[PDB]
Structure formats: C-alpha cells, structure tokens
Amino acid sequence: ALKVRTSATFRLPKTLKLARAPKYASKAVPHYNRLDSYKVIEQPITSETAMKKVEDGNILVFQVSMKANKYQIKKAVKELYEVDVLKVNTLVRPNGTKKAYVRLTADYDALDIANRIGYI
Amino acid sequence: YATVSKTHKTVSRAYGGSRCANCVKERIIRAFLIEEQKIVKKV
C-alpha cells in the first residue's frame, strides 16, 4: 500500500548531520589571553581631584583598556592588589581613554593600598 | 499584572476575570434551554 498522510503539506525530511572532523587545524596555535590583568589595568590616575576620592571616599581611580567591561575590571583589581571591590563606575574621557572609579569594601582602606602601589 | 497575586485578577466564579456575572448567567440559561429543546426535536 502507501503511507497514510493526514496532512496535504509536504515538508523537508530530517536527515543526519555530521560534526566537523578537519584534516588539519585552522591555526594550530591558539592565541594567548588578549585581555589579561596587566592589560585591563593600565595605570592609576593621580590628579588632585582623583587624590581626594582616595583619601575621603575610599575610591581608587584607574585608567583602563577601552575593551574592558565592569566584570573584567573588578576581576583584575582583585587579582593585582588582593583587595575586595564594592562596585565599579566607568566613563569614557574626552581624550578617548576609559576611567574607572573602583570603591573598596569597608574591610580595606584605599589610602594604604594607594601608597603600597607607590603613587600619592 | 505579573507582580500582583492571582486574587487581584479573578473572581471566584466561572469565567471570573473574563465575563461579567450577567453574561455568565445568560450563558448558563441559554445552554440549558437549547439542549433541552434539542432533546424534544430528536423525538
């Protein structure tokens, strides 16, 4: 006989699909981490306005890579300086660089970390 | 409506938050009377 077709519409049948098994690698050498901790954090900002936040607001001011987001900045600060971060605010400066306001938790002081780095 | 409880969005009756009481009353009366008439039409 013939197959019973309750629908008058014919549709493309589902066929097996195989995954790729290349004979050679696409590049054969993976690229290293494009944004590691030393690239996310470029250098601290040491203007007079930024120094007041360090003393008063318990906030460290950094210049960061334009490609880094808030997740990467928080992770980099913890690994580079062994501190805890409460929150991160970022902005793009008129000269084309990114500035991050990093506020530490109450268990840490921004003043003693700042002079441990070397800037004041 | 996705933040409030279900009691705010319904009434304890059939077709609670969809039809008013009078329309539900007409539905029940119409449903019963028509089905009774169908029986006598069959015989």
Partner: protein
C-alpha cells in the same frame, strides 16, 4: 459496563470537527515529483510513433526468468578472480616457458553498446538483450531494426539495472551472447525459438501500429457516457 457510555460523533456538514483522514491524493508534492509523474502521463496521452512504441512490449516473467538463468552461467570474471588468473599466468608462462595459453578460453556475456553493435554487424551474436528503460532512447532505438536486418534474434527485456547485475555494473542497457558451451547449446536453442516468436516474427506488423492516445480516468468516464 455502567461507567462507559456510547457517545457517537456526528461528522456531517456543520457538525463536529472532521477527523484525520488519508489525504495522500491531495498532497502538494515537490516539483521534481510532479514533473516525474506528468512526464509519464504526457508520453501516453500523445500518439507514439511505431519506432518508439515497439518498446512497450517486454518479455514475460516466465521466459525472462529462463533467460537470466542461462545468462547467469556466463558471468564475466571479477576483479578478485582476475587476480588469481594473473598470478597463476605469471607463474606459468614467465618461468615455465609457456605460450601464454595455460588458461582455458573464457565464456562470458558480451556487454557495451559500441561492442555489441559491432558484434551484430559482424553476425557474431547468437542472442541480444535490449533494455526498455534507456532514457536517452536514441541509443537503443535502432537496435531492433539492426538485429532484424542482420538476422540476429533479439529480445526487449525489462530492467537496465537487472542487466547490469550480470555484468557487475550498475547499468548495462544491452547484453549479448556469442559463444556458448556445448552442454548449454540445447537450452539456448529453446530460448531462441520462444524469443523469435515474440519480437523478430512480429516486427513487420509492429512497425505499422501507433501507440499512445490513452485518455485520463476522468476523460475516459466522460467519453463513455457520451
């Protein structure tokens, strides 16, 4: 018993929703399927000239089965079997100083359109099998006339794929026998007489009859009631 009830559904017009029925007749098939079935229809709606219409007659099941039994006894040698012959021949003539005749003469079915046509023109074929399924029909359309003029009995057999199976190919489209062993000579003679009564002896009248002209099912019913 007292919990189950009979609730028949009314499937009339305006009643309950219709159930799922077999709609294979109304299926919208892909384009390649529809063009495949309509070409079959078009080839029989139109008149068919006798040169092409002669291929509608094919050998019956019983005679075809007997034919393939004889042809299966003369299969060409396989690649694996050819390996044994060459290594035996090499160990025979190269070292034994033979005359390259340490192997018996082969008996096999002749195939190949160019090869078989040449055999017919030289009056060497004892029986020729012709496939009716060759889509470029011009390749085989002249063979019945060539066999008729050269006096070579021929048969239009069903299945080009079947002929390929006896020559270890996917498709052959023609096959022929030239030399047969003595023990099977009588068997071939029985087939030749039966085959000749169907194709060679009816060639004169078949060439004067047109095929085709068959109407569709609905047209046939309309033509009957008129």
């Amino acid at each position: 018993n007292p919990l189950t009830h009979s609730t028949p559904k009314n499937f009339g017009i305006g009643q309950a929703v219709q159930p799922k029925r077999n709609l294979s007749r109304y299926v919208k098939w892909p384009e390649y399927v529809r063009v495949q079935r309509q070409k079959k229809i078009l080839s029989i709606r139109l008149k068919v000239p006798p040169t092409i219409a002669q291929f509608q007659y094919t050998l019956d099941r019983n005679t075809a089965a007997e034919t393939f039994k004889l042809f299966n006894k003369y299969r060409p040698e396989t690649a694996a079997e050819k390996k044994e012959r060459l290594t035996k021949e090499a160990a025979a003539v190269a070292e034994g100083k033979s005359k390259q005749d340490a192997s018996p003469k082969p008996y096999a079915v002749k195939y190949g359109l160019n090869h078989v046509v040449a055999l017919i023109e030289n009056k060497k074929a004892k029986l020729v099998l012709i496939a009716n399924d060759v889509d470029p029909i011009e390749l085989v359309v002249f063979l019945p006339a060539l066999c008729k003029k050269m006096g070579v009995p021929y048969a239009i057999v069903k299945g080009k794929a079947r002929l390929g199976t006896l020559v270890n190919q996917k498709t052959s489209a023609v096959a022929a026998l030239t030399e047969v062993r003595a023990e099977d000579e009588a068997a071939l003679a029985k087939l030749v007489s039966t085959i000749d009564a169907n194709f060679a002896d009816k060639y004169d009248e078949v060439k004067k009859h047109w095929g085709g002209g068959i109407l569709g099912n609905k047209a046939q019913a309309k033509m009957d009631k008129r």
